Design an enzyme around this catalytic site. Structure first.
Site, PDB file in Angstrom:
ATOM      1  N   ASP A  11     -97.034  -1.054 -16.342  1.00  6.40           N
ATOM      2  CA  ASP A  11     -96.511  -0.865 -17.687  1.00  6.40           C
ATOM      3  C   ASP A  11     -96.731  -2.076 -18.600  1.00  6.40           C
ATOM      4  O   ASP A  11     -96.579  -3.214 -18.176  1.00  6.40           O
ATOM      5  CB  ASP A  11     -95.037  -0.509 -17.652  1.00  6.40           C
ATOM      6  CG  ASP A  11     -94.594   0.154 -18.926  1.00  6.40           C
ATOM      7  OD1 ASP A  11     -94.795   1.381 -19.044  1.00  6.40           O
ATOM      8  OD2 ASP A  11     -94.085  -0.556 -19.819  1.00  6.40           O
ATOM      9  N   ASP A  13     -95.168  -2.304 -21.801  1.00  2.00           N
ATOM     10  CA  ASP A  13     -94.217  -2.295 -22.922  1.00  2.00           C
ATOM     11  C   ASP A  13     -92.978  -3.177 -22.780  1.00  2.00           C
ATOM     12  O   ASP A  13     -92.229  -3.354 -23.746  1.00  2.00           O
ATOM     13  CB  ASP A  13     -93.755  -0.867 -23.218  1.00  2.00           C
ATOM     14  CG  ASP A  13     -94.895   0.037 -23.634  1.00  2.00           C
ATOM     15  OD1 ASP A  13     -95.892  -0.455 -24.208  1.00  2.00           O
ATOM     16  OD2 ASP A  13     -94.787   1.246 -23.377  1.00  2.00           O
TER      17      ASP A  13
END
Length: 257
Positions: A11, A13
């Site tokens: 990920d 983010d």
């Protein structure tokens, strides 16, 4: 016991890349996967940036990422739509990322009579843009949103996120959208199509439970939560660590030279 994973989703983010130490740790983690021949994709709920933009930035910190190793919710969105109807027309609210993904998956742009409406973040939103989307939906378009995030944290404070803008169409038309991005499973399923691995052999690596880990859980895949620095009815991440560095030995122990 530790399973052998054949593919990683990483990920982009969270806070996992905050500061010099974290960035260097992420770099060594990814280089270990590359060194040991393990396929990976970086995933993100940001529909606005193109895979080139994202990979360029990763490469500027010596984190090895080709354009093809970046998988955004815009790409999951366009793939989903192409799988519904190969020649679909789409009325798109959003910025460069989602437009490019639509273009690159053989789809066409439309207006009030489009097959699909897609909402992705648009800082140039206008009343007429909302209006065309509402009219298309009431004319029979399927309603898709790239991601449900309600706000975007910035130095200004918490700004409107794509979930909030999406709501205009939901409320005005009474039609509930299909959300593509985390915490939904669609982004994970579409990522696995690109990565080429099964649910049973793919690991989702993230630093936020409500979005990253829940997306993996919803897709049925194992998860690794990174605590950068839990109710009983809440399902735990498969694995948990404080630093990506901790996972390196496990990669090396399962993927040899």
């Amino acid at each position: 016991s530790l399973k052998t994973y054949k593919g990683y989703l990483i990920d982009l983010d969270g806070t996992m890349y905050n500061g010099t130490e974290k960035i260097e740790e992420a770099c060594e983690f990814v280089r270990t996967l590359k060194d040991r021949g393990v396929p990976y994709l970086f995933v993100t709920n940001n529909s606005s940036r193109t895979p080139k933009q994202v990979a360029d930035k990763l490469v500027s910190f010596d984190i090895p990422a080709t354009e093809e190793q970046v998988f955004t919710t815009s790409m999951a969105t366009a793939q989903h739509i192409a799988q519904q109807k190969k020649d679909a027309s789409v009325y798109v609210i959003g910025e460069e990322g989602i437009r490019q993904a639509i273009e690159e998956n053989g789809l066409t742009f439309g207006g009030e009579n489009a097959d699909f409406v897609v909402v992705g973040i648009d800082r140039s939103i206008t009343y007429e843009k909302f209006a065309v989307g509402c009219l298309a939906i009431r004319n029979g378009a399927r309603f898709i949103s790239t991601n449900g995030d309600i706000a975007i944290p910035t130095e200004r404070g918490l700004l409107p996120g794509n979930g909030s803008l999406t709501s205009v169409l939901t409320v005005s038309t009474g039609v509930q959208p299909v959300f593509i991005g985390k915490p939904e499973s669609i982004i994970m399923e579409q990522a696995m199509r690109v990565l080429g691995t099964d649910v049973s052999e793919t690991l989702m690596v993230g630093d936020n439970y409500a979005t990253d880990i829940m997306a993996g859980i919803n897709a049925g895949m194992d998860t690794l939560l990174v605590h950068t620095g839990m109710t009983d009815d809440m399902e735990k991440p498969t694995h948990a660590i404080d630093s990506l560095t901790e996972w390196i030995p496990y990669i090396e122990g399962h993927h040899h030279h």
